[PDB]
Design a protein around this nucleic acid. Structure first.
Length: 122
DNA sequence: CTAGCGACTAATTTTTCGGTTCACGGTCCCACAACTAACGAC
């Protein structure tokens, strides 16, 4: 069956449901920290998904090697030790865990790794 | 419930027309002004 839906987005205002000011402020500061960690994360993922392609290019300029993004346990020419999205998610979680939730990391990882493969041509 | 994963503008000059000056052999009709001949008063 075809897609019988069209994606849509709505803006819902939310207040923090706490009695006192200090708890609300603690939650709001935690969420601002979440913002900062998310942006630093996005930077880390994009750098870490740039570098390896240029390592591929380096090897190809060395001996025309056909190195490709795949787990070496599943590919002879693979260099990665796991799935690429897992590599970015790991290299961001190992540093930013315990401060902001990991679902933000997973969503950001998917959102950037999906687009970067399309941007490979450019 | 969370974490790993798939060149334009201003200044100066020059020129045609107008102004000024000199100044010897039909008709018919209705009014209006004369106007004058006769008539009456001193």
């Amino acid at each position: 069956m075809g897609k019988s839906t069209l994606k849509h987005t709505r803006k819902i205002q939310i207040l923090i449901d706490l009695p006192t000011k200090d708890e609300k402020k603690e939650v709001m500061d935690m969420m601002y920290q979440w913002r900062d960690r998310c942006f630093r994360a996005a930077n880390i993922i994009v750098t870490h998904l740039y570098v390896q392609e240029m390592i591929k290019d380096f090897f190809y300029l060395s001996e025309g090697i056909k190195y490709k993004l795949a787990d070496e346990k599943k590919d002879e020419k693979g260099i990665l030790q796991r799935s690429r999205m897992n590599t970015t998610y790991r290299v961001v979680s190992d540093r930013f865990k315990g401060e902001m939730p990991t679902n933000i990391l997973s969503t950001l990882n998917h959102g950037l790794i999906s687009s970067f493969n399309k941007n490979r041509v450019q």
